UniProtKB/Swiss-Prot annotation, chain A:
One of its GO terms (biological process) is protein targeting to mitochondrion. Disulfide bonds: none annotated. It is linked to Charcot-Marie-Tooth disease, demyelinating, type 4A: A recessive demyelinating form of Charcot-Marie-Tooth disease, a disorder of the peripheral nervous system, characterized by progressive weakness and atrophy, initially of the peroneal muscles and later of the distal muscles of the arms. Charcot-Marie-Tooth disease is classified in two main groups on the basis of electrophysiologic properties and histopathology: primary peripheral demyelinating neuropathies (designated CMT1 when they are dominantly inherited) and primary peripheral axonal neuropathies (CMT2). Ubiquitinated by PRKN during mitophagy, leading to its degradation and enhancement of mitophagy. Deubiquitinated by USP30. It comes from Homo sapiens (Human). Belongs to the GST superfamily. Residues 131-254 form the GST C-terminal domain. GO terms for cellular component: cytosol; membrane; mitochondrial outer membrane; mitochondrion; nucleus; peroxisomal membrane. This is Ganglioside-induced differentiation-associated protein 1. Changing residue 208 to R: In CMT2K; recessive form.
Amino acid sequence: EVKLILYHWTHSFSSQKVRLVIAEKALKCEEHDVSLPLSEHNEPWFMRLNSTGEVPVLIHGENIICEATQIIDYLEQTFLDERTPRLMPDKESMYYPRVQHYRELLDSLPMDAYTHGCILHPELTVDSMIPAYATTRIAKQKRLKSKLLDHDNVKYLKKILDELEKVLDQVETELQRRNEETPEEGQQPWLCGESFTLADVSLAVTLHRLKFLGFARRNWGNGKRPNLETYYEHVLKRKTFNKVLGHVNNILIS
Amino acid sequence: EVKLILYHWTHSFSSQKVRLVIAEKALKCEEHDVSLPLSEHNEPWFMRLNEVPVLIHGENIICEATQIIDYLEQTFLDERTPRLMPDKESMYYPRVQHYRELLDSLPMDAYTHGCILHPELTVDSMIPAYATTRIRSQHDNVKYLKKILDELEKVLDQVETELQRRNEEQQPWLCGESFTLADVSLAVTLHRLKFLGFARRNWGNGKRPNLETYYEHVLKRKTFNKVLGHVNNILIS
């Protein structure tokens, strides 16, 4: 009866998680991309990534919910019709702690800082999908001030990239357990078991954004984290992921 | 042609502050009250007071009252548009910001629950008595409420003296001659206190007479009356 209304920036990381959850739950939503093809400074979305989409908002009848995690929690709790896929196991399920654990672990990642780091310090990326010209966009004194900021911001970026690796280690091990427990003839499982969950939305969208930023090759591929690599390949083939997010890394598409 | 869009609950304290700023700044806004006259439990708005408005303006999405209001002040700088804050370097800025922050720190949520839970502490509450009997069958139903009311007295103490300076020095407002964001915070605060039955305990009959005079001036202001004239009326959904 009451309409679902979503205001969002299509390319923002948060909007991607929200819109994928909506698609995975088969919900009808009136979605408003408020982002402009070209800004006041005639920039396209991939030159404005630090400007950032930030905060989507859902309106559902009399409820107003801002921010990705809060919106996703509202959706999972509100749409309980039996036709509606659930992205979370029942709170009494023996699988619930595992799913909740990886959901919070992935949602704790500082994605905004990775993106800012990508643009400010592209020498730490490999095959970033953002053009190099987005990066380009008393004298000893201020010189020294900015030298120090640069030193400080690189130590921060390096610290959180190491933390990302430790998180992706736990994920790789978890996916090894799924690999071990699944026959090569069976349908491939997701992160926490056979059903696609909220932890999968977070992991999937995180990996796709790491790819975009150029922090994929340091973290999987070429023999590194092969289960994670296979997972990402599985993600890209998922019909829902492709329908919702198939073009979001494509800078040719406004 | 950027549209200004507001989703809000009319009777929500935070929405009232936002909508009054919009009118004081003469901004055109597409306002959507999402509240329903009756809940699933057939409660009316005055039973559901325990919200988060959101502005959409072109590409910007702003949640919560204070952020929406700061966004409005920073963005609509056309010279025709009244300003509600003086200037970040002006010497009047720190005074306004201080009272804005002081008022905005009040736990309105606690007072409204307390009004309903412990109506013996109210005088002429506008909430029907049967709300007590329903809420009291089933956040903090404790005597601590009197301490939050005493703390309120101290904030209203501070306001009364600030008003005392203004008249000694057209009627002034709290912080000088022009209507500011601190007046917004104060006017909506007083009006809600009136609604809850905590006006007579805090002003009137010789108590805090500058505050009484201030509240009466607020009620006559065209913008306030046009936007908030009915919000204390339980006959109106």
